[PDB]
Symmetry: D2
Subunit: 115 residues, 4 copies
């Protein structure tokens, strides 16, 4: 996955209906304020979401929600754990927990359309 | 903004409560499927959202929603237009329309906490 | 008419392709412990307009909806939910619904349906 | 008790710090045109558990909520909304609420409040 590679993300776990993607907040991932850009954290969660959902077959994202809990500084190590919440014939929903230093720093919820 | 720069995003419009950010889907923005990664489109919308909201003062994102309408191929030119929906003393909400070839390809809705 | 809509006293004020306006009043049985309009009532109002607007394109079922609350509403307030189409695809569609009262935007609803 | 909750026949089954369980039955006045539980009723149920769970930490007001629908529910179905705390910060808090009936997950609600 080109975008994952460009952001330095690595797949740490993969299994039917689940996936864990990890990354570090690099200098090129910061916002003008000096903390991890919301787009980087979302990209991380979205990547785990994409991998987990696709273990069930071709699927395209329809709607996703991202809830931010704590700002992250440069160098922060982050892991996104995707878990299957619902699996229907035409759609599926996943929860992705973004964790750093053993605490939940963001929560992602997404639904895909199964091709 | 480091992340914006790293993704090749440019600010095309900026004004009180609004902003337009543009970008092109590069080779490093594609997913394993060959289309624009959901994280890239979100990063674009989130950047416009961040710029528009901060014209009102320091603000941090709390919750954001991204609705995807059409897959984008490599080279697609995309623009994210942020508009202020609500401005309260402690929070504010923005709508960000992601457009390509004159059509809405994604819709972003986000709320910030005003510092 | 829709049973739940009727029970809540909601009326369809306008309905056209891709759009709908539903109106209601915050009644005593729509209040929360605080004495203001319950979040569920405002959502029910928005959801009703959403359902009507989306159905103009053919049968559909709601998949995901977001409700953003901006202002509290008091008992007796007359409120409207104005739904407009944001996107119409072959298998899904998305709508924006503004909840307004006395010219003020009370809440914003965003929803996507799966087209049957 | 909460007026809107009462009007919908909802009962508080469990309440502890950061969590709550609200129960109800899909009544005739909770149905949509299709004859299934109206999306607004299921949201009202989830929102009620959300409000109760969040209030255990002190006064708060809902800011943004998401409702994801998975299965339709028929008239007469007994349903529960189970709220759990996902995050508690100084100014905001977030909860996950599962709507379940007959052991099946009917919907998923995610909500964030602003702490007063
Ligand atoms: Cl959402
Ligand atoms: Mg009644």
């Amino acid at each position: 996955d080109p975008f994952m590679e460009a952001l330095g993300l690595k797949v740490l776990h993969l299994a039917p209906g689940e996936a864990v993607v990890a990354g570090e907040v690099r200098a090129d991932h910061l916002n003008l304020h000096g903390t991890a850009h919301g787009g980087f954290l979302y990209a991380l969660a979205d990547s785990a979401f994409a991998l987990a959902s696709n273990t069930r077959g071709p699927a395209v994202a329809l709607s996703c929600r991202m809830d931010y809990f704590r700002p992250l500084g440069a160098g922060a190590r982050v892991e996104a754990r995707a878990v299957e919440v619902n699996l229907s014939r035409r759609t599926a929903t996943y929860r992705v927990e973004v964790v750093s230093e053993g605490k939940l720093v963001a929560l992602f919820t997404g639904t895909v359309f199964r091709l």
